[PDB]
Amino acid sequence: GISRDNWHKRRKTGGKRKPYHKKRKYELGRPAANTKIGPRRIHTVGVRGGNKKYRALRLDVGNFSWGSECCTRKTRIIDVVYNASNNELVRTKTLVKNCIVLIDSTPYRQWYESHYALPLGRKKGAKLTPEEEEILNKKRSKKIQKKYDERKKNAKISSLLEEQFQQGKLLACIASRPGQCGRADGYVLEGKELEFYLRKIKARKG
Amino acid sequence: MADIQTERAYQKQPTIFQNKKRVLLGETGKEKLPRYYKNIGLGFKTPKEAIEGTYIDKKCPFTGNVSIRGRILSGVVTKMKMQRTIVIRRDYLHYIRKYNRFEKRHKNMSVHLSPCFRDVQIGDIVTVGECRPLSKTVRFNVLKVTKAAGTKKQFQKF
Amino acid sequence: MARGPKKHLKRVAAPKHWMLDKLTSVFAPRPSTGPHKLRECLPLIIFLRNKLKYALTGDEVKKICMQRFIKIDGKVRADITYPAGFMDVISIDKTGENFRLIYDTKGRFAVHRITPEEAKYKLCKVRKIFVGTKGIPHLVTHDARTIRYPDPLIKMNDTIQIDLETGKITDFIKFDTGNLCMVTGGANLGRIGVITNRERHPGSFDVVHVKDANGNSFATRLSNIFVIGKGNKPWISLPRGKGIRLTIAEERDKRLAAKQSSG
Amino acid sequence: KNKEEAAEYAKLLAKRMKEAKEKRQEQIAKRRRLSSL
RNA sequence: GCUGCAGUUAAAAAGCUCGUAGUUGGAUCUUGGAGGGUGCGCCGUCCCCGCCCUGCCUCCGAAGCGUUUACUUUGAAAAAAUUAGAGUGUUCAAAGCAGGCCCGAGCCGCCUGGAUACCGCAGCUAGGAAUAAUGGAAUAGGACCGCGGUUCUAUUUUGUUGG
RNA sequence: GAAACUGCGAAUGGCUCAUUAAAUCAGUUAUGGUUCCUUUGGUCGCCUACUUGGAUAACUGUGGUAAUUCUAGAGCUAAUACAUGCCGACGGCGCUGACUCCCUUUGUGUGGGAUGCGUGCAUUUAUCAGAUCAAAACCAACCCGGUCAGGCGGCUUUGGUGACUCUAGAUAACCUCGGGCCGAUCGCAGCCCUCCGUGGCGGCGACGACCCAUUCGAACGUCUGCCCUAUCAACUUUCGAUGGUAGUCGCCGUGCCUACCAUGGUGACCACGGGUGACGGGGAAUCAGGGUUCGAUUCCGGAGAGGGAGCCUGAGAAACGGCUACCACAUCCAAGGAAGGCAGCAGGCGCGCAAAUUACCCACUC
User: Is A19 exposed, middle or buried (0-12, 13-18, 19+ CB in 10 A)?
Assistant: First the structure.
């Protein structure tokens, strides 16, 4: 099958390594999860030394954290936008580490409006009146306005992130190894990385 | 310098986070990138270039995630064809009793070279240290550039 | 070979210091997994029937053990090939004997009776000192005993008086110039002595210059040095010989002089 | 039982300060003598 | 045929020279008096040692710490069997790792053992500073808060915290 | 107490040296790159709880097949097998809070609250933490201690290794889920109740589990040392050759694999290629000294079980006294089928110059 061993191929001298022993389980290795986006499926795999490793095939939600915020929220993973390794991964919408995805934003938005009471971007009046407004209206007199007052300064939030909020989809980078762990986790892009990916996202696009 | 970042992936040191932020001057903030470094040990001074630098090099002993343990060797630089890696020639004496003169013999050793070191130029004697397998060939990492304009055969200056 | 743990020992490939004969059979006991590394141990069977002469057969050694006759460090051990070792106690009760496994100047586990006290406690060399889980700290001794909450002075290479019923460190000795020492491996295995110097190498390998109560000097690896108390004041019994080491000529001089006349 | 060990251990480390704390003092005070000149 | 071969005529110096690798390389840089081992009947004879007729600096330890090595020297690290080789009455011996005693058994027992050595190199230590290489200042450079103008960065501290 | 189930062994040993020439291997190093059964040391409170569900063997009975370590079907039916799920509880503590006082319109400063509603570890991710140094003049805020005439001073803290993103702690969650953990055993024989039948308690003797370390290991990584050959002088990559970078994979390091991107890496200090009465070493034989030759073979390391390749189980196997296909061989048959691998011990054929009993025992050694 598959055989991490170098003891095939050729050395640096270039001499033909001669066959020593067969392919040995200790050398053993495997097919990739090639995990793909959509209704969750996972399979257990037997790994060396006992121990069981999850192979995720297809995933729809992950746990993505807003680092500067210091908060993490679980959201649907909408789609794969960018992948350094290979393009097919993006087109196929396959999940892997370093894959650049778009999450969904709504959980982040709901938290942010609640905590800072300033609502993101320059959405709309009607929306405010509807739900999320109720939260904004809040009160307790009192209760919450004081907290909102305490906050401010940070709360600037960064233009690139907020603009993304308008879309309702935020760029995030998958931190975890879905094929290994079975969890498709990641962190919201930002700052510099976000700048680099945006440049890549627009540059290649068109 | 040259934009590093160059590739397609965003080069960064792991788990060294950011967060830029609002208000004035800098702006954000002036350094804009926190950098993490460490001394290799064995009394190898971590050169300024490492601390001062922008470059990423995971493979770097000072800036990167590699530990130096094991044999510490010295050799002369034969090649600096490859990017971020060099080949050094190690001379050694082979003893032959059966009748006794031993004959000079040599081995070449591939070793990673952090961008912190520069002027890595063939002819330079260098001190490399053992490390975890960096690449299928490379066992070592350049820790110190021994140098010398000397070997006069030319006149070096500063 | 090559799929799993070895379970046999070809005798001859056993450690010399058990002093098993050459003929007899093909296989030696081979120490169970336990508190002491296999080379550095003394399977009870060798103790009961190879040093003490209580047993003849291996069939007998077993018959003895199943009685429960024998405890190591206080807590009946019932395995023929149990890996007892340095600083272990071994107590045969209905016979009233307490023995501490500590070296010859040959480098051979010595048959060394100790008092009915003493048998209570053993000296362990700290191997590692640890922040375990939940923020608790622990020390680990040579004999593979982990004690939590130790007192903060204790550092790797120090030694440590363990109670024994209870576990429980009931003090310690620092590794410092001038401490009494026991040599637990290598050419000098069994020599006792003060210190003098620790030469230190980064990367690897620290040597300990030892001087004996005869101004005889020697080195070993730090790995091989065990602290056992304060000059002229061991914290345990020493075997006859005070781990001295005498030249083969001195050794001859003692052997012929003490007897064929001298009582 | 574990609680007692943790509490007792803290006392030794915390109590040791009293005897050790004095050690530091023998430095701060002197830090003024050297600076004097 | 290293130690330790032959090649004018016996088997064997290329017709001759240039020549890279390889090998090989001139001179010249520091100068009796007692201590301890074994022979000879209180006396001495004959080695070996610091001496008479030489790590700097940091500022005893520690540390700084090495100009590079090779070399050689002293240690450790060095599987057992084997082999050299100690102790040991297998009747002898090759072996084997024993055994030998106190004891007339009431001893309701004593006890010596089963040494050590070798172990290439390479690596590790350490002392030497000869030997052989190796280090620079002559299209001037290194030293010593010798002194300054310019600019940067790190945290002590004006109780506390911010400028 | 036959059996059966269950659990564990069967991955060890034994055997041979065919493959195999810096491969294997030896001495040296290493894991801060990782897995590890077991032993050993630690680690175990949150209305079915005085304890949950229902089925297979052994068995009975009935059979089939020329022949099977074949097995059908049915009726039961055990568990430390199998799938579940709880009494336990304990909280002040977090965010919320009907609110209320004092010194001042608004406000601002100092204060304190009855009643509501994530908190065991593991894993993954993200963040913080993991504190190293010496003095002053002013301005804006405010703590205590001694005060009268706005006026005098002042303090408290962070585990180790030469080096880690190490260990540990804090914050936000996550589920790897039913599919992490926190446990649904036995045989033999006198107590007490702030009080009356209960609930709490007392002798002898018969494996699991999570996480960490340990032990036996494992898998890789360092160098330095190998036979003959030049009638083998240039080699290695479009089916990766050497390197970057990122991922997928693996116990994990690594072109392992794959994308993109470079054009490398090696050689007269013998590479490359080829050969081989080459498994490698400890060792053996021949003794001036130097040397000269051998090593399959009682130990160590490596390799294989007809040839090749694949795989299951399990901590550990790419296992052949497992299985599976092909390939080469051989066997039984009622001809459809069916079953097999002595480089294990004896023995036998063939081969040859050449090599033993189809014997006894688990008592010794283990």
Answer: exposed
Using only C-alpha atoms, chain C has a radius of gyration, in whole angstroms, of 20
Pick among 2.40.50.1000, 3.20.20.120, 1.10.290.10, 1.10.10.10: CATH of B2-152? 2.40.50.1000
Chain A residue nearest residue B8, CA to CA: A84
Question: Which residues from 107-136 of A have any strand F atom under 7 Å from their CB?
Answer: none
A42-46 and A52-56 as β-strands: parallel, antiparallel, unpaired?
A: antiparallel
Resolution of the experimentally solved model in angstroms: 7.0
Handedness of CA C87, C88, C89, C92 (dihedral sign): negative
Which one-letter amino acid corresponds to residue C247? T
Delimit the domains of chain B by residue range. Answer: 2-152
CA-CA distances (angstroms) from residue B22 to A117, A154, B17, C91, C166?
A: 18, 6, 16, 74, 61
> Residue C45: which CATH number?
3.10.290.10
Q: Which two tokens stand for residue B114?
A: 């952090």
Separation between the CA of C57 and the C1’ of F360 (whole angstroms): 22
H and E: helices and strands count for chain A: 8, 8
Between the alpha carbon of residue A202 and those of residues A81, A82, A198, A206, B12, the distances in Å are 11, 11, 6, 7, 21
Backbone φ/ψ region at B19: left (φ over 0), alpha (ψ -120 to 50), beta: beta
Quickly tell me which residue has 């002491």 as its tokens.
Answer: C36
Q: Is residue C262 part of a domain?
A: no
Q: Does B10 touch chain A (CB under 8 A)?
A: yes
Q: Which residues of D touch C (CB under 8 A)?
A: 2, 5-6, 8-9, 12-13, 16
Helix axes A191-204, A159-167, angle to 10 degrees: 50
Q: Is the CB of B107 within 7 Å of strand F?
A: yes
Residue at C261 is within a domain = no
Indicate which technique resolved this structure: X-ray
Per DSSP, helices labelled H in chain C are: 44-45, 58-67, 248-258
Residue lying closest to nucleotide F98, CA to C1':
A140
Phi and psi at B75, nearest 5°, equal -160, 175
Which region holds residue C92: left if phi is over 0, alpha if psi is between -120 and 50, else beta? beta
Token pair for residue A62? Answer: 């992950």
Q: B72 and C202 in contact by Cβ < 8 A?
A: no
Contact flag, residue C185 CB and nucleic strand E, below 7 A: yes
The range of the structural domain enclosing residue C224 comes to 175-245
* Strand E proximal to C248 Cβ, under 7 A: yes
Q: How many Å lie between the alpha carbon of B64 and the closest alpha carbon of chain C?
A: 20
**Whole-Å CA distances, D26 to A91, C153, D22, D23:** 71, 22, 7, 5
